[PDB]
């Protein structure tokens, strides 16, 4: 609950790296992993699909 | 903006300090400060009013 819900209704998958100004990993309880991006063309905030290949490589270039 | 929303739809102003098991400030762009609490016996996760005096009394110790 009523008061609390996950900030991402769904994940968007047609967002290109060149379009995103910032990326943030939301740490909200009882919610799956959530990456939030600040945009261009619109400039809004979107929840991006973590399975995006470019997000994967980006998150993977954080070590092994 | 069709996908992202603030995780708190409203704040709960009647919760007592005795009832809260855990508190967590949420990192959340384009939203006001938001505090999530886990309730003691039923374990529900609720958004609680930052304006609550005991919440202040805690954040003012920082
Ligand atoms: Au962001
Ligand atoms: Au438009
Ligand atoms: Au919590």
Curated annotation (Swiss-Prot), chain A:
Outcome when changing residue 5 to K: Slightly impaired binding and activation of CXCR4
Site entry: Important for integrin interaction and activation: 21, 24, 40
Effect of residue 11 to A: No effect on anti-HIV-1 and chemotactic activities. Slightly impaired chemotactic activity and no effect on inhibition by heparin
Residue ranges of the region described as Receptor and heparin binding: 5-9
Recorded consequence of changing residue 38 to Q: Slightly impaired CXCR4 activation and clear resistance to inhibition by heparin
Coiled coil: none
Region annotation (Receptor binding) ranges: 15-17, 24-26, 36-46
Disulfide feature: 6-31, 8-47
Reported effect, residue 24 to S: 55-fold reduction in binding affinity for Link domain of TNFAIP6
Amino-acid positions noted as binding heparin in the UniProt annotation, renumbered to this chain: 17-27, 38, 45, 61
Result after altering residue 13 to A: No effect on anti-HIV-1 and chemotactic activities
Protein name, per record: SDF-1-alpha(3-67)
Gene name per UniProt: CXCL12
First-to-last residue of the parent protein present: 25 to 88 of 93
